[PDB]
UniProtKB/Swiss-Prot annotation, chain A:
Modification note: Phosphorylated in its N-terminal serine residues upon induced DNA damage. ATM and DNA-PK are able to phosphorylate FUS N-terminal region.
UniProt family annotation: Belongs to the RRM TET family.
Effect of R14C: In ALS6; results in aberrant trafficking and cytoplasmic retention of the protein
Tissue specificity remark: Ubiquitous.
Protein name as catalogued: RNA-binding protein FUS
Subunit note: Self-oligomerizes (via N-terminal region). Oligomerization is essential for chromatin binding. Component of nuclear riboprotein complexes. Interacts with ILF3, TDRD3 and SF1. Interacts through its C-terminus with SFRS13A. Interacts with OTUB1 and SARNP. Interacts with LRSAM1. Interacts with SAFB1 in a DNA-dependent manner; this interaction tethers FUS to chromatin. Interacts with MATR3. Interacts with SNRNP70 and POLR2A; these interactions couple RNA transcription and splicing.
Coiled-coil regions, chain positions: none
Domain of life: Eukaryota
Curated annotation (Swiss-Prot), chain B:
Name of the gene: TNPO1
Biological process terms in GO annotation: protein import into nucleus
Origin species: Homo sapiens (Human)
Protein known as: Transportin-1
PANTHER family: IMPORTIN BETA
Keyword terms of this UniProt record: Acetylation, Cytoplasm, Host-virus interaction, Nucleus, Protein transport, Repeat, Transport
C-alpha cells in the first residue's frame, strides 16, 4: 500500500473483551 | 529544643474536637481554619505532639491529628524547616510500635509519606533504624517497622543502588524472618522480597537458593496471606530464574495445581497466574506432561462467574483462567481438542445459564489456537450461537456476541446466506438490546465482523446505518464510544459506497450534535475524531458541507497542545504536561480531510498555520506524533503542493533523520511522504537525494522488515529515480532484487505505475540490471492491466535484453505463467 494509519489498533483496544 | 505551652495546646485540642463535630456547616468552618493554620510550622509541631506524646487524649483525636499532619506533609513538606521535620521523624520512629492499632497505623502512614514525599535520600538513617527495629523484643515494634519497610519497598523499589545499596543488608535479613513464629511477620517478609524478583536484584539473586528453600518451607502455611505471597513469589521466579526451579518443577506444578483450587479466592487467583506465565516458556509442553489432563477442567471450572459477580453484573480468577486457556490453546493447538470437547459438550447445552455461559466463553477463548481443529464443529456450533443471541439472560447474549466475533473469519469465508446473513441480522437486533452490557458486546462484535467482511456488507449498508444511527438515541457515554468505533470501521470497510445523500443526512446530524457538545479537554474526542477521520475519507467530496469547523478545530487542538507542552517544558512544577493524544487524533483527522477532500482543502490551508505547526510536530520526541505529522505531509503534498513547496528545504533533512526502521510506522510515513514530494518536485529534488537514498537502500535490503515498509521504500526509490535518474541509477545493482521481489505483489495502481516508470528510466544504467535480470522480468509480468505508455516502455527493455537468440536457455527457467504473459503483452 502506502502509509500507516494506526487507527485500527486504537479501535481494537477500546473493544469489549471478557478477559 | 521545642516544647509546647498550654494555651496553644488548648486551641489545637479545641480545633481538633470541633473538626469531629457532626453538624452540617461547622465542618466547613473548621476546614477553612485548618487551611490557614496548615502553613505554619509551629502548628505541625503541635500536631505530631498530640499524636505521639499527649497520651492523655483519646485515640481518635490523636490519630486524626496525625492524619492532618500527613496531609500537610503531602502538600507543604518542601516548606518544612529541618527542625520541625527532624522532630516529626524522631517521634515517629520512637513510637513505631504503639499498643494502639489505630495510633500504630497512623505513625506508619506518617513514616511512609515522609519517606516517599521528600524522598529517601533526605532521611538517610530511616532504613538502618527500621532494620534495627526488626530485631526488637516487642512484637508491635517489629510488626510496625516491617509494615513500614513493606510500604517503602512497594513504593520505592527502584532505589536499588544509589541511599547507598541498602538492599544488600535488608534482603538477606528479610530472608531470616521467613521462619518467624508470627504469620503476620512472615507475610511482610516475603512481601518485601517479592518486590525485587523481576528486577533480578543482586542481593536477592546471590541468595536465590536460600530464597527458594525458605519458600518451599512455607508452602503449607495455613494463613492465606503467606500462601498467596508464596504463590506470587513462585510465579515471578518462573519469569527470571527458571533455571533454579527446573530441578523442582514437578512438585511445583503439583503445588500450584492444588493452590489454583484454593478455598481462598485470592490465593487461587495468584496461583492461576502461574499457568499464564508458564505458557510463555518454551519448556511448557515438557513441564505440563503429567498434569495437563487435570489443569484443563480446573481452568474451565474457574471460568464461571463467581456468585458476587453474578449479582453485581478489573481482574479475577475468571479472566485469569480464561486467559490461561487462551494461551494454552495457542501452545497446544489441535492437541488440546480432546481435552476441551468433552467439557464443551457438557457445558454448551447445559440447563443452568451460568454453566452454559462459561461454555460459550471457553468456545471463544480457544478459538485462535484451536481454530483449524474446530472447523468440523462450526457448521453446528455457529447456528447454535446465533440462536443464543436471543437467549433470555443478558450475560449469555453478551458472551455469545464475543465468541461469534472470534469466529468471524470462518463465517465470512462461507456462503453469505448461510451464516453471515443471519448472524448480521441478529447482531444488528442485539445492538438495540435493552441491557447496557449487551449493547457494548454486540457493538464490539459487530465492529469485529465489519473488519472481516469489508465489501460483503454493501448489500446491507442501509439496514446497518438504520441501526447504527438509531443507537445514538439509546446509547449514552460509555457505548457511544464503541458506537463511534463501529461507524468508523463501517466507513473503512465499505469506503466510497457510503457517499450517497440518504446516508450522509441520516448520519452526520447526530455526529455533529455530539461534536458540538464535547469540549476540547474531553477525551471522548478520541473515538469521535478517529471516527470522523474514517467517515471523511469515505465521504470524500461529499464531506464538504461539514469540513470548515472540523478543520479549524483540529488545527486548534494541535496549536494548544504544542503551546501547553512548551509551557510545561518551561516551568514543569507549575504547568502540567499536555496529553499529546489530542494532537495525534487531530493530526490524523486532518490527514483524513486531506485524503478525502483532496484539492478542495486548499482554501482551508491557504488561511492556516498548519504547516508551521507541522514543522514542530515532526520534531516531537514521541513517535506517534512524528508518525501522524509525516502522514499529513504526504496528504497535503498531494492536495495543495503550492503551500508545501516553500517548506521542503526545511522538511527534507527532518524526513532524512526519520528513516530509522526501529520505529516502523514513523519510518514508513516518512518514506511515503518523500515519494509524494518527489512527484511534484520534478527535477528540483536533485539536492535532497543524498540525504535519503543511501539509507533507503539500506532499509530495503534489511532482513525481517515488514512487507508494507518494503513496498513503500520500493515505491519511493522508484519515484526518486523517475524524477532524478542521474543519482539514483548507480545503485540499481544494489537494490533491484528486493525492489522487484517486493513490488511484484502490489495491485496495479498509480503508485505502482509511478514506481515502474522510475525503474525503466534508471535506461540510464542498463548494466545495473543484467546480473539479476530474472527479477525484473518477473516484476513486469506482475502487471495485469498496464496503461499503454508503460506497455510500450516495457517492450523496449525486454526486447533490448533479448538482443544480447541466445537467451532461450535463461528464458526457459521461467514458470509457465511468466513465460506466457510476457509473450502475450510484449511479444518476447
Amino acid at each position: 500500500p502506502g502509509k500507516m494509519d494506526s487507527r485500527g489498533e486504537h479501535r481494537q483496544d477500546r473493544r469489549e473483551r471478557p478477559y | 529544643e521545642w516544647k509546647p505551652d498550654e494555651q496553644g495546646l488548648q486551641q489545637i485540642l479545641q480545633l481538633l474536637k470541633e473538626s469531629q463535630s457532626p453538624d452540617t456547616t461547622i465542618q466547613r468552618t473548621v476546614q477553612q481554619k485548618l487551611e490557614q493554620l496548615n502553613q505554619y510550622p509551629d502548628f505541625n509541631n503541635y500536631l505530631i505532639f498530640v499524636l505521639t506524646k499527649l497520651k492523655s487524649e483519646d485515640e481518635p483525636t490523636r490519630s486524626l491529628s496525625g492524619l492532618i499532619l500527613k496531609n500537610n506533609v503531602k502538600a507543604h513538606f518542601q516548606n518544612f524547616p529541618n527542625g520541625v521535620t527532624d522532630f516529626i521523624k524522631s517521634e515517629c520512629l520512637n513510637n513505631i510500635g504503639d499498643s494502639s492499632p489505630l495510633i500504630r497505623a497512623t505513625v506508619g502512614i506518617l513514616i511512609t509519606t515522609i519517606a516517599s514525599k521528600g524522598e529517601l535520600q533526605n532521611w538517610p538513617d530511616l532504613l538502618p533504624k527500621l532494620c534495627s527495629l526488626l530485631d526488637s523484643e516487642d512484637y508491635n515494634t517489629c510488626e510496625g517497622a516491617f509494615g513500614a519497610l513493606q510500604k517503602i519497598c512497594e513504593d520505592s523499589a527502584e532505589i536499588l543502588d544509589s541511599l547507598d545499596r541498602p538492599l544488600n543488608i535488608m534482603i538477606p535479613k528479610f530472608l531470616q524472618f521467613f521462619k518467624h513464629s508470627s504469620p503476620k511477620i512472615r507475610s511482610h517478609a516475603v512481601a518485601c522480597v517479592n518486590q525485587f524478583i523481576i528486577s533480578r536484584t543482586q542481593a536477592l539473586m546471590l541468595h536465590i537458593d536460600s530464597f527458594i528453600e525458605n519458600l518451599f518451607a512455607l508452602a503449607g502455611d495455613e494463613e492465606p496471606e503467606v500462601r498467596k505471597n508464596v504463590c506470587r513469589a513462585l510465579v515471578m521466579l518462573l519469569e527470571v530464574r527458571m533455571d533454579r526451579l527446573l530441578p523442582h518443577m514437578h512438585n511445583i506444578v503439583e503445588y500450584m495445581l492444588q493452590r489454583t483450587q484454593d478455598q481462598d479466592e485470592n490465593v487461587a487467583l495468584e496461583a492461576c497466574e502461574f499457568w499464564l506465565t508458564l505458557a510463555e516458556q518454551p519448556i511448557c509442553k515438557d513441564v505440563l506432561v503429567r498434569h495437563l489432563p487435570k489443569l484443563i477442567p480446573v481452568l474451565v471450572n474457574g471460568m464461571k462467574y463467581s456468585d458476587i459477580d453474578i449479582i453485581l453484573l478489573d481482574w479475577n480468577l475468571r479472566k485469569c483462567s480464561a486467559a490461561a486457556l487462551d494461551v494454552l490453546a495457542n501452545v497446544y493447538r489441535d492437541e488440546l481438542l480432546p481435552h476441551i470437547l468433552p467439557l464443551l459438550k457438557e457445558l454448551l447445552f447445559h440447563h443452568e445459564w451460568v454453566v452454559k455461559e462459561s461454555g460459550i466463553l471457553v468456545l471463544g477463548a480457544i478459538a485462535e489456537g484451536c481454530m483449524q481443529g474446530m472447523i468440523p464443529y462450526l457448521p453446528e456450533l455457529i447456528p447454535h450461537l446465533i440462536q443464543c443471541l436471543s437467549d433470555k439472560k443478558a450475560l449469555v447474549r453478551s458472551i455469545t456476541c464475543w465468541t461469534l466475533s472470534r469466529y468471524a473469519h470462518w463465517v465470512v469465508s462461507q456462503p453469505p446466506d448461510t451464516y453471515l446473513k443471519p448472524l448480521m441480522t441478529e447482531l444488528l437486533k442485539r445492538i438495540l438490546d435493552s441491557n447496557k452490557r449487551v449493547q457494548e458486546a454486540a457493538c464490539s462484535a459487530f465492529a469485529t465482523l465489519e473488519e472481516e467482511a469489508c465489501t460483503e456488507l454493501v448489500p446491507y449498508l442501509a439496514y446497518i446505518l438504520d441501526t447504527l444511527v438509531f443507537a445514538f438515541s439509546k446509547y449514552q457515554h460509555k457505548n457511544l464510544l464503541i458506537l463511534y468505533d463501529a461507524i468508523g470501521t463501517l466507513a473503512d470497510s465499505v469506503g466510497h459506497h457510503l457517499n450517497k445523500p440518504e446516508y450522509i443526512q441520516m448520519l452526520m446530524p447526530p455526529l455533529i450534535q455530539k461534536w458540538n457538545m464535547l469540549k476540547d479537554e474531553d477525551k471522548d474526542l478520541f473515538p469521535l475524531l478517529e471516527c470522523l477521520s474514517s467517515v471523511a475519507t469515505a465521504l470524500q467530496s461529499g464531506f464538504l458541507p461539514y469540513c470548515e469547523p472540523v478543520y479549524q478545530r483540529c488545527v486548534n487542538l494541535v496549536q494548544k497542545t504544542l503551546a501547553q507542552a512548551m509551557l510545561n517544558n518551561a516551568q514543569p512544577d507549575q504547568y502540567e504536561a499536555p496529553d499529546k493524544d489530542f494532537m495525534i487524533v487531530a493530526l490524523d483527522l486532518l490527514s483524513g480531510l486531506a485524503e478525502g477532500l483532496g484539492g478542495n482543502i486548499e482554501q482551508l490551508v491557504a488561511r492556516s498555520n498548519i504547516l508551521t505547526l507541522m514543522y514542530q510536530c515532526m520534531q516531537d520526541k514521541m513517535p506517534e506524533v512524528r508518525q501522524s505529522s509525516f502522514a499529513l505531509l504526504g496528504d497535503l503534498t498531494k492536495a495543495c503542493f503550492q503551500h508545501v513547496k516553500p517548506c521542503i528545504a526545511d522538511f527534507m533533512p527532518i524526513l532524512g533523520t526519520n528513516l530509522n526502521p526501529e520505529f516502523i510506522s514513523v519510518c514508513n510515513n516518512a518514506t511515503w511522504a518523500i515519494g509524494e514530494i518527489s512527484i511534484q518536485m520534478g527535477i528540483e529534488m536533485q539536492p535532497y537525494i543524498p540525504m535519503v537514498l543511501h539509507q533507503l537502500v539500506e532499509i530495503i535490503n534489511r532482513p525481517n522488515t515488514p512487507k508494507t515498509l518494503l513496498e513503500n521504500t520500493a515505491i519511493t526509490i522508484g519515484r526518486l529515480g523517475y524524477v532524478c535518474p542521474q543519482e539514483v541509477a548507480p545503485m540499481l545493482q544494489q537494490f533491484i532484487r528486493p525492489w522487484c521481489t517486493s513490488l511484484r505483489n502490489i495491485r496495479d495502481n498509480e503508485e505502482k505505475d509511478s514506481a515502474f516508470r522510475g525503474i525503466c528510466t534508471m535506461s540510464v544504467n542498463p548494466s545495473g540490471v543484467i546480473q539479476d535480470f530474472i527479477f525484473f522480468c518477473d516484476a513486469v509480468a506482475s502487471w495485469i492491466n498496464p496503461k499503454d505508455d508503460l506497455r510500450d516502455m516495457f517492450c523496449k527493455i525486454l526486447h533490448g535484453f533479448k538482443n544480447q537468440e541466445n537467451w532461450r536457455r535463461f528464458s526457459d527457467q521461467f514458470p509457465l505463467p511468466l513465460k506466457e504473459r510476457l509473450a502475450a503483452f510484449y511479444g518476447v
